[PDB]
Design a protein around this ligand. Structure first.
Ligand SMILES: [Zn+2]
Lengths: 56, 44, 124, 89, 112
RNA sequence: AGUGAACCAGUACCGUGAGGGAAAGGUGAAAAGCACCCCGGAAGGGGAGUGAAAUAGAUCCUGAAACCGUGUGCCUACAAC
RNA sequence: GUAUGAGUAGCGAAAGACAGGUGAGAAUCCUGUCCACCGUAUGACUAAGGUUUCCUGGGGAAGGCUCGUCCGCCCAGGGUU
């Protein structure tokens, strides 16, 4: 099977309307304020749930 | 699956080299036609 | 129970290795599917380390890796602990009075070459 | 011709070690003998020679600026002495 | 007084179609929001746009402007750069071409 | 176009061989070819400077079309073009 | 010279895991530990053939079907008695 006709600019772009990116739940840290992914450790300060985790 | 070109050093000089081209009268036709074109290599 | 991209004997090898780590190190970075399967396996080892007897020891020795050391110990010798000896002398007595739930998982970040979601699994 | 035969000395890290066993490295002429080099060295310094050794060196492909071609050929001879010394620096 | 600053990256070795998925997530945002949005997207071009955005901000601060807190991402786009041409060997003795594409990336920031 | 060849061309490349055989000219009058600073590993960029002009910055005279984008005045989710 | 097919087919037989190093940046480079594969060969030596690919110190624009701090790649020196 081979395309019998080339596809135009409008139909290409109408195909490409469900082809995007999303940036889902982003919150602010409770300890240091900066934004972070919910249910994840904060990469800026290593605090999750009010305690220090990436330290010893 | 053996291909056609199998390299060898003696054969290439004995079939295509300068002295083989010099020993026949048609070899020298070849060498003159190559010198007349400007080839940097006139005989293998 | 989560095939993990492997055949039946390679899954078993991989789990036997990742749980002997974390007995020796107590904190590890891994992907998120492996960490769940491993929480299950490691706590099954700890409730044999709490049982204590010879039958339990030989049951664990079918699953804990052997020629691995775990040493922070010297009185005056080269005295080595064996990572099954640690299971039975150290980690069982630690969790004596706790019921199940000897581990916990935290989520960090996706790996650069992969976008694989990574995770830290630790003990207390 | 005894004075066009030896060209110059070789000064590398493998040749400094040889000077401590009484051995000296020279780039000599192509078309030279073991014997001819020996004569030339005994003539130009007044030493006594045990044993020249001799090698040939291939040229190397080089490529500077979209133009490529080979360096020279080379001849290297290593001269051993009985007891005397030459001072090159 | 001018209130605006641009930066640009030229002939970066990423494809212009994929870089456009990331840059539509950032247009019209405050500079405060764009950085965190870029830090949590794992697409190869997310971290390149991060450097171009940070150069726009440094230019604003040092050459002309002030007020990093007022800035907003006002313009953004991705154009095409020159492409390299290669060939990959195929079955049965033939070969087919391969395009190695490039992008120019430019960001602009205004005081508001 | 004019010699295959205005440029390091009977060259690179192709073939065991005889033999076949290309692509590729132009900153500015003068290199005055961007000292110094800032972001960045670098590449690249923004100021400041040279210059009559840099959107003349070396992929450098002019810079058409296909093709790819960004912004907007008007139209569009009961319709067979 | 540039589109469409389309961010689609494919990425060329096979077992890895974790700790620690280096670094701007690490599934892919280094060091360790355990695990797994060949073993009339996937081990050792050699004649053709190739022709510097060999060793040491640097590099990361292109080549490497991903990555790369690495390399049979790139730059500088050196090696065959
Ligand atoms: Zn925080």
């Amino acid at each position: 099977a081979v395309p019998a006709r080339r596809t135009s600019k409008a139909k290409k772009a109408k195909r490409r309307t469900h082809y995007k990116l999303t940036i889902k739940g982003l919150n602010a840290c409770s300890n240091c304020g900066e934004m972070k992914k919910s249910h994840h450790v904060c990469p800026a300060c290593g605090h999750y749930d009010g305690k220090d985790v990436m330290s010893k | 699956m053996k291909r056609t070109y199998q390299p060898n050093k003696r054969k290439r000089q004995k079939v295509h080299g300068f002295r083989k081209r010099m020993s026949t009268k048609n070899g020298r036709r070849v060498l003159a036609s190559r010198r007349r074109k400007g080839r940097k290599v006139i005989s293998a | 129970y989560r095939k993990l991209g492997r055949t039946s004997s390679q899954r078993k090898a991989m789990l036997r290795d990742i749980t002997t780590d974390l007995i020796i190190n107590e904190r590890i970075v891994t992907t998120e599917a492996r960490a769940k399967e491993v929480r299950s396996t490691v706590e099954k080892m700890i409730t044999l380390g709490k049982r204590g007897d010879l039958h339990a020891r030989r049951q664990a020795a079918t699953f804990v890796r052997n020629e691995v050391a775990s040493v922070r110990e010297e009185d005056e010798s080269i005295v080595v602990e064996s990572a099954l000896q640690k299971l039975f002398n150290d980690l069982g007595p630690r969790f004596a009075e706790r019921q199940g739930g000897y581990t916990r998982i935290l989520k960090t970040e996706p790996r650069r070459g992969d976008a694989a979601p990574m995770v830290v699994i630790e003990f207390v | 011709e005894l004075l066009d035969v030896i060209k110059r000395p070789v000064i590398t890290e493998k040749s400094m070690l040889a000077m401590d066993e009484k051995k000296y490295t020279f780039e000599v002429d192509t078309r030279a003998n073991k014997t001819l080099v020996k004569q030339a060295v005994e003539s130009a310094f007044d030493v006594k020679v045990a044993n020249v050794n001799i090698l040939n060196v291939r040229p190397k492909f080089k490529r500077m600026g979209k133009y490529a071609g080979y360096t020279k050929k080379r001849r290297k001879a290593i001269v051993t002495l009985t007891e005397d010394s030459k001072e090159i620096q | 007084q001018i209130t605006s600053a641009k930066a640009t990256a030229k002939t970066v070795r990423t494809s212009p179609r994929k870089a456009r998925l990331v840059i539509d997530l950032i247009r019209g945002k405050s500079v405060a929001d764009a950085i965190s949005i870029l830090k949590f997207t794992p697409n190869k071009s997310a971290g390149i746009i991060e450097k171009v955005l940070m150069s726009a901000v440094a230019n604003a601060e040092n050459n002309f402007d002030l007020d990093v807190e007022s800035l907003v991402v006002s313009e953004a786009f991705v154009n095409e750069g020159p492409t390299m041409k290669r060939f990959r060997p195929r079955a049965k003795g033939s070969a087919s071409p391969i395009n190695k594409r490039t992008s120019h990336i430019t960001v602009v920031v205004t005081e508001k």
